[PDB]
Amino acid sequence: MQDAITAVINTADVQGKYLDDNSLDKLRGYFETGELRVRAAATIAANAATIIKESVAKALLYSDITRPGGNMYTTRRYAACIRDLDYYLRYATYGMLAGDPSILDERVLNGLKETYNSLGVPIGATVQAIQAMKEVTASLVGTNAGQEMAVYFDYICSGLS
Amino acid sequence: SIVTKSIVNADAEARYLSPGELERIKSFVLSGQRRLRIAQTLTENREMIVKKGGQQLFQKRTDVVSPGGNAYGEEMTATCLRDLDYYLRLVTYGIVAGDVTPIEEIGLVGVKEMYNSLGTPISGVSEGVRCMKDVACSLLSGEDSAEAGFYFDYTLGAMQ
């Protein structure tokens, strides 16, 4: 992976250039936003369990998946489901706090669509679950940090779809 | 199923089924009709076990019934008895299977993580299954409710 800093050093490095004013403006941008990203990651760290509980209650609640034959019907598949929402929340936080979604390219979205199309996991319900985490999370961290988390949850949703 | 609990065993040992194991399979397939009597009785008496076990559950444990409890509300209370119906059905699968694999893989694998993700106290679930064990032992014979009651005991040991 890489953060925003590493990505700047990658483009400047791979052209052979030094750091010019543009790249320093990008590093200024990240260093301005850093503390906001830190407190957002702190609050998500605090309330992860309730984000997953409220997002499953919004998104998978009152649905046929719960009923016999749906994909969440057993205890093993329920636990695997909420486990995957834990992964989405956690890597979305890493992607937010790095400022670069390369993490999501490397360790989440690789092979995931082939996996869910292999197993029989409904992609639509997954995407709606992630958007429920996006709404609850934005409600916890506020406007700015909710926009930041919104680009990474939307990145995962764009990856699965 | 009991049959599976042998093929996997000597499969991982990469040998044919052992003679001792083979005798059990014979004892299993000859004990079949008694097992189907047991699961027949627990099948056709499910409403009494779920209702009466739910009554003894809520009378022993007034935590959930009360407002602010996990099970409070008309929709919520119904679900609680829906889960007791699930375990009761599973117990019947475990009886005809001759093994708790059906009970374990449908009901017990990862149960603590689910009810902790629901906010449900799992000790109340175990008290409910114990209540259904008392009712189901009231509906059967001596040795019969020893057997079926011990399947319920496995589920209690998995919840606790």
Partner: peptide
Amino acid sequence: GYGAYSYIT
């Protein structure tokens, strides 16, 4: 496994 997810069912 005893509980298996077929699309058919």
